[PDB]
Design an enzyme around this catalytic site. Structure first.
Site, PDB file in Angstrom:
ATOM      1  N   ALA A  21       0.084   1.616   9.642  1.00 22.84           N
ATOM      2  CA  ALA A  21      -0.465   1.347  11.003  1.00 22.84           C
ATOM      3  C   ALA A  21      -1.405   0.063  10.481  1.00 22.84           C
ATOM      4  O   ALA A  21      -2.268  -0.944  11.262  1.00 22.84           O
ATOM      5  CB  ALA A  21      -1.173   2.232  11.448  1.00 22.84           C
TER       6      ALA A  21
ATOM      7  N   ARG B  42     -13.150   1.116  -3.352  1.00 21.23           N
ATOM      8  CA  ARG B  42     -14.073   1.323  -2.087  1.00 21.23           C
ATOM      9  C   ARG B  42     -13.625   1.905  -0.809  1.00 21.23           C
ATOM     10  O   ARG B  42     -14.389   2.908  -0.303  1.00 21.23           O
ATOM     11  CB  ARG B  42     -14.643   0.018  -1.479  1.00 21.23           C
ATOM     12  CG  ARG B  42     -13.688  -1.253  -1.300  1.00 21.23           C
ATOM     13  CD  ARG B  42     -13.949  -1.912   0.098  1.00 21.23           C
ATOM     14  NE  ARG B  42     -12.834  -2.444   0.449  1.00 21.23           N
ATOM     15  CZ  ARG B  42     -12.195  -2.696   1.591  1.00 21.23           C
ATOM     16  NH1 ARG B  42     -12.744  -2.146   2.687  1.00 21.23           N
ATOM     17  NH2 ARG B  42     -11.235  -3.833   1.738  1.00 21.23           N
ATOM     18  N   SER B  43     -12.279   1.550  -0.614  1.00 21.92           N
ATOM     19  CA  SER B  43     -11.346   2.411   0.630  1.00 21.92           C
ATOM     20  C   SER B  43     -10.256   2.400  -0.140  1.00 21.92           C
ATOM     21  O   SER B  43      -9.583   1.738  -0.737  1.00 21.92           O
ATOM     22  CB  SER B  43     -11.555   1.513   1.854  1.00 21.92           C
ATOM     23  OG  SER B  43     -10.729   2.021   2.862  1.00 21.92           O
TER      24      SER B  43
ATOM     25  N   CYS C 203      -9.563  -3.899  -1.950  1.00 22.42           N
ATOM     26  CA  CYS C 203     -10.031  -2.389  -2.008  1.00 22.42           C
ATOM     27  C   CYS C 203     -10.448  -1.931  -3.567  1.00 22.42           C
ATOM     28  O   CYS C 203     -11.087  -0.756  -3.347  1.00 22.42           O
ATOM     29  CB  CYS C 203      -8.860  -1.625  -1.494  1.00 22.42           C
ATOM     30  SG  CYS C 203      -8.766  -1.308   0.431  1.00 22.42           S
TER      31      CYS C 203
ATOM     32  N   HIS D 195      -9.840   8.428   2.756  1.00 26.52           N
ATOM     33  CA  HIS D 195      -9.761   8.555   4.008  1.00 26.52           C
ATOM     34  C   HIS D 195      -8.233   8.959   4.384  1.00 26.52           C
ATOM     35  O   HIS D 195      -7.405   8.298   3.966  1.00 26.52           O
ATOM     36  CB  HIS D 195     -10.086   7.747   4.900  1.00 26.52           C
ATOM     37  CG  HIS D 195      -9.642   6.417   4.929  1.00 26.52           C
ATOM     38  ND1 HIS D 195     -10.164   5.460   4.119  1.00 26.52           N
ATOM     39  CD2 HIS D 195      -8.410   5.488   5.289  1.00 26.52           C
ATOM     40  CE1 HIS D 195      -9.451   4.266   3.930  1.00 26.52           C
ATOM     41  NE2 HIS D 195      -8.396   4.605   4.908  1.00 26.52           N
TER      42      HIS D 195
HETATM   43  O1  LIG Z   1      -4.637  -2.731  -1.998  1.00 25.33           O
HETATM   44  C1  LIG Z   1      -4.954  -2.376  -0.810  1.00 25.33           C
HETATM   45  N1  LIG Z   1      -5.480  -1.074  -0.665  1.00 25.33           N
HETATM   46  C2  LIG Z   1      -5.682  -0.463   0.639  1.00 25.33           C
HETATM   47  O2  LIG Z   1      -5.706   0.726   0.588  1.00 25.33           O
HETATM   48  N2  LIG Z   1      -5.186  -1.309   1.781  1.00 25.33           N
HETATM   49  C3  LIG Z   1      -5.551  -0.641   3.006  1.00 25.33           C
HETATM   50  C4  LIG Z   1      -5.476   0.764   3.510  1.00 25.33           C
HETATM   51  C5  LIG Z   1      -6.802   0.860   3.214  1.00 25.33           C
HETATM   52  O3  LIG Z   1      -7.123   2.342   3.692  1.00 25.33           O
HETATM   53  C6  LIG Z   1      -7.645  -0.075   3.944  1.00 25.33           C
HETATM   54  C7  LIG Z   1      -8.971  -0.312   3.557  1.00 25.33           C
HETATM   55  O4  LIG Z   1      -9.972  -0.110   4.716  1.00 25.33           O
HETATM   56  P1  LIG Z   1     -10.597  -1.696   5.476  1.00 25.33           P
HETATM   57  O5  LIG Z   1      -9.836  -1.250   6.744  1.00 25.33           O
HETATM   58  O6  LIG Z   1     -11.957  -1.354   5.273  1.00 25.33           O
HETATM   59  O7  LIG Z   1      -9.884  -2.623   4.820  1.00 25.33           O
HETATM   60  O8  LIG Z   1      -6.556  -1.164   3.780  1.00 25.33           O
HETATM   61  C8  LIG Z   1      -4.549  -2.459   1.767  1.00 25.33           C
HETATM   62  C9  LIG Z   1      -4.481  -3.010   0.391  1.00 25.33           C
HETATM   63  F1  LIG Z   1      -4.020  -4.370   0.423  1.00 25.33           F
END
Ligand SMILES: O=c1[nH]c(=O)n([C@H]2C[C@H](O)[C@@H](COP(=O)(O)O)O2)cc1F
Ligand SMILES: C#CCN(Cc1ccc2[nH]c(N)nc(=O)c2c1)c1ccc(C(=O)N[C@@H](CCC(=O)O)C(=O)O)cc1
Ligand SMILES: C#CCN(Cc1ccc2[nH]c(N)nc(=O)c2c1)c1ccc(C(=O)N[C@@H](CCC(=O)O)C(=O)O)cc1
Ligand SMILES: O=c1[nH]c(=O)n([C@H]2C[C@H](O)[C@@H](COP(=O)(O)O)O2)cc1F
Lengths: 316, 316
Positions: free
Chosen positions: A315, A218-219, A198, A259
Site C-alpha cells: 500500500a 528509521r522506519s 529508510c 511497525h
Molecule cells: O527501502 C525502503 N524501505 C521501506 O521500508 N520502505 C517503506 C515502507 C516503510 O514502512 C516506509 C517508511 O515509512 P515512511 O512512510 O515514513 O517513509 O517506507 C520503502 C523503501 F524504499
C-alpha cells in the site's frame, strides 16, 4: 537459532504495539526502539519460516555496491523492487502522455481494469529503459538512492565523497576505530525525496579479527521490509570481511519505528505457526577479492530449506 | 528505579567487555551495541549514585539550543567543558607565541610544572575571549559543534538549514511521522574535525500525546561521558514537549562503542558500592514557551540527593 530475533520482534509488536495512523491509509502497530542481534559465525539469517528470495537481495545489494542509481541493471537482472518510483517520475510528465495512470499502483494492489495498463504501459517504460540509453538515463536513473548515498556524497565544494570506499580502507589500516560510519541521511536533500532513506545510518567494528556492523533503520515494516533488511546488511557485512580479510561477528539491527501493517497480521500469525529450521550458509568465491566486482556467480547461498512464501499488499 | 540502566551498562562492560586500544593510550573495555531506556514519566535520570552537576549540563544544552558555536556564553556561565579545543586551535598559532604548551592538557592530567602555565596562559586566553569581541570571534568561536550541526546545516547551494527548528515545527502539525530526525554527522566535514560528533543521530516520536526520543551515540565513555549524555537528551526532550505541548515518554539511548577506560575501573566499582536513591524531578517555567529562550532561571531540578562525586582523568 538465528532467526528468533525476528519472531520475537514481530511477536512483541502485535502484543505490545500501540496503534498509529501512517502516510498512507492502513494503520500500524508500532514499537519504537529495538536492537535485534544475529551471530553471523553460525549463519546467515535468511528466514527459514518464510521464503524470502536471495536472488533479488543480491542484485539489489550489488547495485548499491558499485555506484548505481540506475534501474537498467536491476531490470536486466529480473529484479523490479525499485521499478515504480521511475514510473511516478514519468507517468506524470511531458514525454508521457498516455493512460489515466497518474496515480497507479495502490489502485492496482486492488485496481479497476488497471492491471492491463499499470502492468502494460509500465512494461513499455521498463523496456525502452533496457534498450534506449537516452531513455535509461532519464526516466530510469533514480537520482538519489542508497547507491549515490554510500558511494557518492554530494559536497558543498563541488564533488562527491565515496564514503564506503573510505570506510573499507580505514577498516584495513586503522581497525579499532570508533569512526566507521556511512550515514545515508543528508539534510539538504530530505525536505524533498519520495522516500528518505529508510536505512539511515550504519557503523562497523572489528575487535579480535571479526567484523560486527550495526544498522539504525528509521522506519521498518515488520513483515515485508524487515526480512530483506536483515539479510542485505548481513550480506553486506560478509562481503566487507572477505575484502578486509576479517571473520564475521555480528550484525546488529536497530530500529526507530518498527511497525506492522494492520492489513497483514492474519499473515504474520500464520508465520508463527512455523518453527524455524536450520539456518542457511553463504559462500563467497576466493578468486575475488575487491568486493566491488561480484556478480551473482560470486555469492552462493547454500542449503536453504524454507517454509512456503506468505503474501502481503504494498500500500506503500 | 530510573538509573539502573547505567549500572547494568557499566556492569556489563567490565564483565562482558573485551579489550581494545584507543586513540590515545589507555585501553578500553568495550561493548558494541546497547539500547538503554528511561521512563521519563517518573523522573529525570540524573545519577543519584554519583554527583553529576546539572548546572553545567543546562548551560551546555542551552548553548546548543540557540545557535552557538562560541564558548564566550559557556565561559560567562562558569562552564569550561569545551574550553580546551579553543586553546589547541590557538597554542599552535600566529597570534600566540608564548609557552612550551604545544600539547598541553594530557600532560597536565599529570604534568611537570605545567599546571601554572596550562592553567595560567589558558586563563589569559579565556579572559581576552570574554572581553575582546575580536578575540572571541576567532580563537573562541569553535566552528562546528552540535550547535551549528542542529541549528545550521551548511548546504551545497549556499545556505544553512535549521534542522531542529524544522523538526519541532513538524512535531506540532504532522505528529505521527517516522521522519523526525536531526543528524549531526555531515561527511564533507568528518575527514577533518578534532572530534567528529560523538552524538550522531537522534529521532523523535509522539504516539498517545507524550514524546519519546532515541539517540544513537557512536562513541560513549561509560563512566564520565555517559552520565551527562543521558541527562542532556533527557533535558532536551523535556524542553521539546513543553514547546510542542506533549507529555514525556521515553528517552532511549543507543550505542556503538560504549567503552570504559582502564584508568577508571577501581572508581566505577566504588560507584557500585552504592544503591540508587529516589530519582530527581525537573521544572520548566510556564510563562516560557518558545524553548529557545530559556535561561537558567527557566529549568529547575528538584530534590536531588546524591552520593558523593567520583573523580576520573581526561586523557581524552
Ligand atoms: O527501502 C525502503 N524501505 C521501506 O521500508 N520502505 C517503506 C515502507 C516503510 O514502512 C516506509 C517508511 O515509512 P515512511 O512512510 O515514513 O517513509 O517506507 C520503502 C523503501 F524504499
Ligand atoms: C527497496 C525498495 C523499494 N520498494 C517499495 C516499497 C513499497 C511498499 C512497502 N511496504 C512495506 N510494508 N515495506 C516496504 O519495504 C515497502 C517498500 C520495495 C518494493 C517491493 C518489495 C517487495 O519485494 N515486496 C514483497 C513482494 C510481494 C508482493 O507485494 O506482491 C516481498 O517480497 O516481501 C520491497 C521493497
Ligand atoms: C562536550 C565536550 C568536550 N569535553 C572533552 C572530553 C575530553 C575527555 C573525555 N573523556 C571521557 N572519558 N569522556 C568524555 O566525554 C570526554 C570529553 C568534555 C570535557 C570535560 C568533561 C567533564 O566535565 N569531565 C569530568 C570532570 C572531572 C575531571 O576530569 O576533573 C566530569 O564531570 O565527569 C566532559 C566533556
Ligand atoms: O561530546 C563528546 N563526547 C565524548 O565522549 N568525547 C570523547 C570521549 C569519547 O570516548 C571519545 C570518542 O571516541 P573517538 O576517540 O573515536 O573520538 O571522544 C568527546 C566529546 F567532545
Amino acid at each position: 537459532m538465528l532467526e528468533q530475533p525476528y519472531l520475537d520482534l514481530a511477536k512483541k509488536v502485535l502484543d505490545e504495539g500501540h496503534f498509529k495512523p501512517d502516510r498512507t491509509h492502513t494503520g500500524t502497530y508500532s514499537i519504537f526502539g529495538h536492537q535485534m542481534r544475529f551471530d553471523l559465525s553460525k549463519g546467515f539469517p535468511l528466514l527459514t519460516t518464510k521464503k524470502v528470495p536471495f536472488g533479488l537481495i543480491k542484485s539489489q545489494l550489488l547495485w548499491f555496491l558499485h555506484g548505481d542509481t540506475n534501474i537498467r541493471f536491476l531490470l536486466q537482472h529480473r529484479n523490479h523492487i525499485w521499478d515504480e518510483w521511475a514510473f511516478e517520475k514519468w507517468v506524470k510528465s511531458d514525454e508521457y502522455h498516455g493512460p489515466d495512470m497518474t496515480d497507479f499502483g495502490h489502485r492496482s494492489q486492488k485496481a479497476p481494469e488497471f492491471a492491463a495498463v499499470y502492468h502494460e504501459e509500465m512494461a513499455k517504460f521498463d523496456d525502452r529503459v533496457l534498450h534506449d540509453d537516452a531513455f535509461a538515463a532519464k526516466y530510469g536513473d533514480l537520482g538519489l538512492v542508497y547507491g549515490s548515498q554510500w558511494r557518492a556524497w554530494h559536497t558543498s565544494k563541488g564533488d562527491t565523497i565515496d564514503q564506503l570506499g573510505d570506510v573499507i580502507e580505514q577498516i584495513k589500516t586503522h581497525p579499532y576505530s570508533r569512526r566507521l560510519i556511512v550515514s545515508a541521511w543528508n539534510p539538504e536533500d530530505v525536505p524533498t525525496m519520495a522516500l528518505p532513506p529508510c536505512h539511515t545510518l550504519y557503523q562497523f567494528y572489528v575487535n579480535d579479527g571479526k567484523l560486527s556492523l550495526q544498522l539504525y533503520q528509521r522506519s521498518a515494516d515488520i513483515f515485508l521490509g524487515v526480512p530483506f533488511n536483515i539479510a542485505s546488511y548481513a550480506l553486506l557485512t560478509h562481503l566487507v570481511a572477505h575484502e578486509c580479510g576479517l571473520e564475521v561477528g555480528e550484525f546488529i539491527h536497530t530500529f526507530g519505528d518498527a511497525h506492522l501493517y494492520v492489513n497483514h497480521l492474519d499473515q504474520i500469525k500464520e508465520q508463527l505457526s512455523r518453527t524455524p529450521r536450520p539456518a542457511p550458509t553463504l559462500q563467497l568465491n576466493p578468486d575475488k577479492h575487491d568486493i566491488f566486482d561480484f556478480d551473482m556467480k560470486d555469492i552462493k547461498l547454500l542449503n536453504y530449506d524454507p517454509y512456503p512464501a506468505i503474501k502481503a499488499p504494498v500500500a506503500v
